[PDB]
Design a protein around this ligand. Structure first.
Ligand SMILES: CC[C@@H](N)c1cc(OC)cc2c1CN(c1cccc(-c3nncn3C(C)C)n1)C2=O
Ligand SMILES: CC[C@@H](N)c1cc(OC)cc2c1CN(c1cccc(-c3nncn3C(C)C)n1)C2=O
Lengths: 284, 284
């Protein structure tokens, strides 16, 4: 729900062209603007506590950065909410590497730079993505990089707000319990770790431990040694160092997104959309 | 699975509404066959929370934890049958008798620590230690009650855990909060320290301060753990007990078993006779 919501059928302004797939929740459709012919992405969510959707919309609406999917408005019609966003012609990095195979170090370097620019902006607004992965990093026809799917971020923000509201009397509560109730058990630096895992996923086609049961992975991480790239000789010492510092086990010692932007791997002068246009030609 | 699908009034006569807990209403009831009194908690009946609460009570076999006799499901009402505690809660008692003596508080703290050491040995956390949740029977015995908060937290943790998806990109601190929350069983030791102050002063510290502000006060780096108001009224052993149970850093906070060897609660003259004395004052 939103004060700027369009209380109208989205088919008044758009032609639905094809179903693309789901996100954390909702189904995304490729649509075409009836007036300009411009393509958009429409995420349809069936409708309940509307708190998560209100937060998702607020997150998208208050973002004005090139590395974050552009938000064009939402429609409420027949108990379906449609969130209209920027369309990304090549899909996610996962749609691409599943066909093309491993990305080169330069292509990964450019993607990490673009994601870090988007993360530095999000963290500057006190926002946390919490779901950084290849499937949530979209590529348009121009080789440009966009962060998408704030569903997890919205669920966490709504859950935190719902928790403070029903926490009751805190007079017997221990300080560590009061701290988790107000700020959760972590901060925005979790996004820097997820980006390092994503760099390994782009290089190896899977995140570390993918073949291990999700619950067993949670227990292993909770003596845990941060993952490393498999083939040392395939990558430069700069890429190995990038993985090392992004995957700093202690968040306190983990560098911020702005600090990571001056790391040699992502501050190289030859990084641009042309590296991704090369990958898209390989997909063709 | 062992819930009795029948009306509890077949076996019990409802005598009086006593009051509510975290959820539900507690009634004083009489066994039709033996004339023995029981406590029946009625809850209007997602059943995840009630399932965990019954499981917590059913798997406890310790004298300092209120006895569980079974549950009834009838006419969309769940009745949890438990041991009746003739004197009620310590809050019901101190609201009539006034402040408890140091020896009476020492015995209550010993009994609660024995119950906590047992709960923590089964990987359980009370999370709601306070005077209202410490019950006293006619024999002056001490029983921990109301696992409603513990059940809500356990159900919430299992619900978010089942609907979190792939954790392969999650930072270790995010995986830790997903598996064990942002704190451990040592939160119960802090709550016991606050409860000891509540028994001594009739209110927990900061009782008159807004609940949300109290949360902020504790999160601050300069937060000082509470102390007893009248220093000259209590022994240095009671002051030290408050000092170590209210250790700000949960890492430095002693366990329940370690606290059981503290001078205050290891005194040889601590027995139910101290509460029987308190109950004779109540009889007047
Ligand atoms: C799952 C379909 C995906 N494989 C795919 C394939 C594709 O092929 C041409 C194009 C697109 C997408 C996604 N997408 C988009 C755009 C804007 C927002 C969102 C978004 N907002 N919330 C969740 N999402 C996405 C991340 C689920 N998505 C596209 O433009
Ligand atoms: C609110 C009534 C209280 N003032 C009171 C007054 C009283 O007067 C003689 C007797 C009793 C109680 C409580 N109670 C009992 C017993 C067993 C379990 C539970 C229980 N299980 N889950 C939550 N509870 C309670 C703690 C909320 N309660 C008694 O036997």
């Amino acid at each position: 729900v939103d004060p700027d919501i369009f209380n109208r059928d989205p088919r008044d302004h758009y032609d639905l062209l094809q179903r693309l797939g789901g996100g954390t929740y909702g189904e995304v459709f490729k649509a075409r603007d009836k007036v300009s012919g411009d393509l958009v992405a429409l995420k349809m969510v069936k409708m309940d506590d509307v708190s998560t959707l209100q937060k998702e919309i607020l997150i998208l609406k208050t973002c004005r950065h090139a590395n974050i999917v552009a938000y064009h408005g939402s429609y409420l019609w027949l108990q379906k909410l449609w969130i209209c966003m920027e369309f990304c012609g090549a899909g996610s990095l996962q749609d691409i590497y599943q066909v093309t195979g491993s990305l080169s170090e330069l292509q990964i370097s450019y993607v990490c730079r673009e994601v870090l620019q988007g993360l530095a902006y999000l963290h500057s607004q006190k926002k946390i993505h919490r779901d950084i992965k290849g499937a949530n990093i979209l590529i348009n026809d121009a080789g440009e990089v966009r962060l998408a799917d704030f569903g997890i971020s919205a669920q966490i923000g709504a859950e935190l707000a719902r928790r403070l509201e029903f926490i009751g009397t805190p007079y017997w509560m221990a300080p560590e319990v009061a701290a988790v109730a107000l700020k959760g058990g972590y901060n925005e630096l979790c996004d820097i770790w997820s980006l390092g895992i994503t760099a390994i996923e782009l290089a190896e086609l899977q995140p570390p431990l993918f073949d291990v049961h999700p619950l067993r992975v949670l227990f292993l991480m909770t003596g845990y040694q941060p993952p490393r790239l498999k083939e040392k000789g395939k990558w430069s010492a700069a890429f190995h160092n990038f993985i090392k510092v992004t995957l700093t086990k202690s968040p306190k010692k983990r560098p911020s997104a702005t600090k990571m932007l001056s790391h040699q791997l992502v501050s190289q002068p030859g990084l641009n959309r042309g590296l991704i246009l090369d990958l898209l030609d390989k997909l063709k």
